[PDB]
Structure 1
Amino acid sequence: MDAAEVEFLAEKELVTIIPNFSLDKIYLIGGDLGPFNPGLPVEVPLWLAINLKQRQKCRLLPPEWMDVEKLEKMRDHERKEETFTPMPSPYYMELTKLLLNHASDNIPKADEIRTLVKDMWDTRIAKLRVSADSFVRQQEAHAKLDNLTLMEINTSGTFLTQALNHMYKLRTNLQP
């Protein structure tokens, strides 16, 4: 894969907007939406909230896990534990990029949410290169990754698997 398709899979998460136009139910091949009552919340998939925000037709809302207090506890829980701890949403990096870039003025304290998210990320990446070094160092044959999201996997996967194949080969070249 590549980041630009993880970003595609991440635009299926649901968010809540507040439209300012009138429209009746829409029957999408992936569900139903609406109705859109001006000045009333409604829950849509991201790829539509962003596209409506760019055309000046809505007003986003911060997801509940995107609070500057619960995050300041996740950031500590992550540094205490010594394994991959569970995360608010399986796609938090892409949410807190797309949202904070496109709707940073409808989110209070954007430039602290952003730094806490980055602090969590910079740790969950450090635990990986330790869990991906003991693997080689001790020549394991299995490794249980607990709560890795698809993005951390995809940033260093096409190197790790490709450097473990060359190790299986070198380790089983004497049998015949």
Structure 2
Amino acid sequence: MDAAEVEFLAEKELVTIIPNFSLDKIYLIGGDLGPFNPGLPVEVPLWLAINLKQRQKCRLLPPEWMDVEKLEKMRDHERKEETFTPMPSPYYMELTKLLLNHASDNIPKADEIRTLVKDMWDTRIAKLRVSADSFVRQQEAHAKLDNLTLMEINTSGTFLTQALNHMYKLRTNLQ
């Protein structure tokens, strides 16, 4: 599994858009959507929001949590804590990338939001590095990681699993 499939799974998260046209509610295999009314908020999957945005048939609304002040406090909380903190959503990185790349005209201070999200990502990768180092150095067999996101696990899991396989082989070769 590559990062592109993780973003593909991220594209399922629901977001709120402002349609500028009318259309009867659609019955997708994944769920009902609509009805649509100009100027009325509607909840649709992120990929659909992006598609409509490219078609310039709606206005994208930024998530309530996507706020420079809130994101800055979340980053400071993650930095002050030694363990991983609960993330607002399981696909924050993909939603930030897609929204800032396709809706910068609707998101104020997109650059600062991108910097805050990149800082949070850096601090979580560093904390995952220190956690893997502690796990390996003590030759542990169990570790809890409820707050880790799919993107990071998929980014470094083949390396971590190969290293653990080698450590298990060396640890059990005396037979």
Q: Shorter-normalised TM-score: what interval?
A: over 0.9
Structure 1 distance, partners of 2:25, 2:137, is 57
Q: What do you get for the CA RMSD once the two structures are aligned? A: 0.9
Give the C-alpha shift of residue 142 in structure 1: 1.1
Q: Across the two proteins, how many residue pairs are aligned to each other?
A: 175
Structure 2 distance, partners of 1:78, 1:28, is 38
Give the C-alpha shift of residue 51 in structure 1: 0.6
Structure 1 distance, partners of 2:146, 2:33, is 34
Provide runs of 4+ in structure 1 moved above 3 Å.
Answer: none
- 1:12 touches 1:46 (CA, 8 Å); kept in 2? yes
Deviates more, 1:8-17 or 1:131-140: 131-140
Structure 2 distance, partners of 1:55, 1:5, is 24
Structure 2 distance, partners of 1:79, 1:136, is 23
Q: Percent identity over the alignment? A: 100
- 1:16 touches 1:44 (CA, 8 Å); kept in 2? yes
- TM-score scaled by structure 1? 0.97
Structure 2 distance, partners of 1:70, 1:59, is 23
Structure 2 distance, partners of 1:109, 1:61, is 14
Cross-structure match for 1:98? 98
Structure 2 distance, partners of 1:7, 1:72, is 24
Give the C-alpha shift of residue 135 in structure 1: 1.4
Give the gaps of 5 or more residues in structure 1. none
CA distances 1:113-163 after superposition (whole Å, capped 9, x unpaired): 111111111100000111111111111111111300101111111100011
- 1:85 touches 1:146 (CA, 8 Å); kept in 2? no
Which SS does the other structure have where 1:124 is aligned? Answer: helix
Which SS does the other structure have where 1:139 is aligned? Answer: coil
Give the C-alpha shift of residue 72 in structure 1: 1.2
Where in structure 2 are the equivalents of 1:1-176 lying within 5 Å?
1-175=1-175
- 1:83 touches 1:146 (CA, 8 Å); kept in 2? no
Give the gaps of 5 or more residues in structure 2. none
